[PDB]
Design a protein around this ligand. Structure first.
Ligand SMILES: Cc1cc2nc3c(=O)[nH]c(=O)nc-3n(C[C@H](O)[C@H](O)[C@H](O)COP(=O)(O)O)c2cc1C
Ligand SMILES: Cc1cc2nc3c(=O)[nH]c(=O)nc-3n(C[C@H](O)[C@H](O)[C@H](O)COP(=O)(O)O)c2cc1C
Lengths: 104, 103
């Protein structure tokens, strides 16, 4: 019910810079293993890239979106991910972060 | 999905991040919120014994869950089920707290 991450689109490859304990438990990764990496590590071969394209379009356009996609825990167990994404911009109107909430 | 991040390495443990849900719940804008300690949500009917629990939990750097009166920007009373969680790095350094607000 409380699974979320913050990413930094200002750093190369838009890596995760924060994850809740819920996200860690959901995905089986530790904070050490996750931070500094783009969340795409949760994807795998059975993930539909057309569905990821919607995420891509939202990030480019810098707008919120919500999509369902196949995701893999560290061990390769699949987990339910209804992903909600939201951009955050600073006072000068420049994109600052994205936050993402994983519903399961 | 109402949540905030604070930075306890910064003076008075101020909010450095707030979700849109938190903004809508409290009626504040992000500009009005960042750099401030979350206590501005408190007011006259906020149980001071409950604030002491949050106080001790932050002191000991442990997670906690409490229920207390908060006030929106317009002064509107609301009950806040607040969940706090500290985050530290691999070298043991306390880095953030995150909090999640249920109303
Ligand atoms: C805040 C945020 C959270 C994200 N969470 C997930 C996630 O939980 N699972 C996932 O498969 N992709 C997630 N993504 C998507 C990837 O990070 C990336 O945007 C997507 O794979 C498209 O980028 P790419 O084409 O370079 O791989 C998230 C993206 C952002 C910005
Ligand atoms: C991450 C985080 C989120 C918090 N959210 C709230 C909140 O939503 N409402 C509230 O009344 N206090 C909240 N607090 C508690 C206050 O910031 C403060 O710690 C509390 O009032 C006790 O400190 P004080 O005695 O110095 O005021 C939060 C604290 C942290 C660390």
């Amino acid at each position: 019910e409380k699974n979320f991450v913050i990413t930094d689109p200002r750093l190369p490859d838009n890596p995760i810079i924060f994850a809740s304990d819920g996200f860690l438990e959901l995905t089986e990764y530790s904070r050490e293993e996750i931070l500094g990496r783009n969340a795409r590590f949760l994807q795998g071969p059975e993930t539909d890239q057309a569905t990821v394209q919607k995420i891509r379009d939202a990030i480019r356009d810098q707008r919120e979106t919500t999509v369902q996609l196949i995701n893999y825990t560290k061990s390769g167990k699949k987990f339910w991910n209804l992903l909600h994404l939201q951009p955050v911009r600073d006072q000068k109107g420049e994109l600052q972060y994205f936050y993402g909430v994983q519903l399961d």
